[PDB]
Amino acid sequence: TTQNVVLTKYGFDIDRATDQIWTGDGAKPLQGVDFTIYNVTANYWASPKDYKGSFDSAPVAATGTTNDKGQLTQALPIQSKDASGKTRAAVYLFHETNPRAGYNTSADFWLTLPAKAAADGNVYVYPKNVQKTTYERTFVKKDAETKEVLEGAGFKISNSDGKFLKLTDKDGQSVSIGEGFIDVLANNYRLTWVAESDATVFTSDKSGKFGLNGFADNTTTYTAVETNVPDGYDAAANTDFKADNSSSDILNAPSGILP
Numbered sequence: 334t335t336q337n338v339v340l341t342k343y344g345f346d347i348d349r350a351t352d353q354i355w356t357g358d359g360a361k362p363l364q365g366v367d368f369t370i371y372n373v374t375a376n377y378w379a380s381p382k383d384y385k386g387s388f389d390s391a392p393v394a395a396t397g398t399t400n401d402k403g404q405l406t407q408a409l410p411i412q413s414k415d416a417s418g419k420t421r422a423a424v425y426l427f428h429e430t431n432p433r434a435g436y437n438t439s440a441d442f443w444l445t446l447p448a449k450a451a452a453d454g455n456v457y458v459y460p461k462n463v464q465k466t467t468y469e470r471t472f473v474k475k476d477a478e479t480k481e482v483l484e485g486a487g488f489k490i491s492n493s494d495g496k497f498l499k500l501t502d503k504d505g506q507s508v509s510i511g512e513g514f515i516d517v518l519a520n521n522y523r524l525t526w527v528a529e530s531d532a533t534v535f536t537s538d539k540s541g542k543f544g545l546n547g548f549a550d551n552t553t554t555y556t557a558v559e560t561n562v563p564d565g566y567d568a569a570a571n572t573d574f575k576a577d578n579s580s581s582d583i584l585n586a587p588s589g590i591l592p
Contacts, residue, residue, distance in 0.1 A: 335408040336446055337455045340427065342366050342403040342462060344436055349459050351444070352451045362403025363462060365503050365521045367431035370395040370407060373443060377424040378415035386441050388426050406455075411446040422446060427460065431503055434547055435518045436462045468576035469546035471514055472557060474537040476566075477584035482541030484512075486585065487561025489532040493554060497532035499525045500545075513538035517547030524548070534560060541582075548576030557583065 343357040371388035395407045413423040426443040439460035448456040474483040490498040500515070501523045502508050508522065510533050517524070524547060535543045557572040566585040574581070 334412075335410050336448065336450065337406055337408050338425070338448075339455050339457050340368065340399070340405045340407075341457065341459055342399045342405075342433075342439075343459065344433070344462050344464055346464055349457070351448045351456045351458065354451050354453075354457055355459060357403070362399075362401070363433045363436065364399055364401050364403065365431075366399040366429060366433050366462075367503075368397060368399075368405060369393055369428045369430050370409070371426045371428060372413055373424050373426045374413040374421055375416040377443075377445075378419075378421050386426060386443060388428065388441075391426070394425055409446060427458070429460070429462075432462065434503075434521050434523065435464055435467050437465050438462070467518070467546060468548040468551045469544065469578050470548070470574055470576045471542055471544040471580040472537075472572070472574075473541040473580060473582045474543070474569075475541055475582050475584055477586040482537070482539075483563060483566075483585055484537055484539050484541065485561075485563050486537040486543075486559060487534045488536070488543065488557050489529065489534060489560050491529075491556045491558060492526060494526070496526035497529045498555075499527045499531055499533045501525055510535070512536040512543065513540075514542050515545040517545050522547065536561070542580075551575055551577045559583075559585075 342363045343360040344363050349355050371391040372394040373388055373391045376387055377384045397405045399405045410423055415421045423446045428441050429438045432438045439462050450456050474486045476483050503521050537543050554573055559568045562568050567588045569583050569585050572583050
């Protein structure tokens with residue numbers, strides 16, 4: 334016999350009971366968060382009063398990923414064996430292995446089954462993920478003579494170590510990135526640092542804007558390098574910046590033609 338444990342992951346800027354079906358009251362549900370569920374029955378029952386969440390050498394009961402609604406369901410046996418081979422009430426520990434971008438991981442928590450279930454026979458848990466402050470930056474490419482904005486200019490970004498920015502999805506895979514401001518938070522991307530040739534190219538949109546959010550801090554200096562220059566212009570100088578939530582303009586001078 335098993336119970337269903339429904340994990341629901343909401344983000345925050347109370348311990349809710351397992352019998353409570355809580356909608357988050359407007360807080361956003363967090364999709365794409367990975368969990369491993371360890372069967373820690375042997376570890377708890379080796380000495381209950383001493384248990385403090387070790388999953389050392391504990392078998393894995395389950396894995397998965399929160400969905401569009403922040404949810405992850407699993408059917409878990411209400412009983413399982415202890416180290417001495419004796420049947421006990423099962424204990425399961427939840428371990429977040431991959432948070433959502435912009436969020437701290439949640440604390441490992443655990444519970445005994447069978448647990449107190451809500452009206453629908455399910456046991457509801459609600460790990461707290463606290464939002465960590467991240468920073469962003471926008472740039473607006475313009476024509477240095479006309480001061481009009483400029484579409485189609487391509488840029489890469491480098492750090493203090495000479496490594497360039499590549500965005501990936503939650504699992505580290507390549508993604509294809511288009512023009513404009515890139516919402517890393519909403520797409521659950523990651524910032525990685527690689528060789529120039531593997532870098533992600535950012536590109537001014539029809540309003541000249543490009544950039545991203547999802548920076549870890551606002552103290553590191555980064556550099557925007559123009560790598561694709563619109564025809565008829567001269568490269569702007571490299572632009573040092575901080576991820577400080579500001580917008581600033583980058584000027585392309587129209588190249589001069591003499592007779």
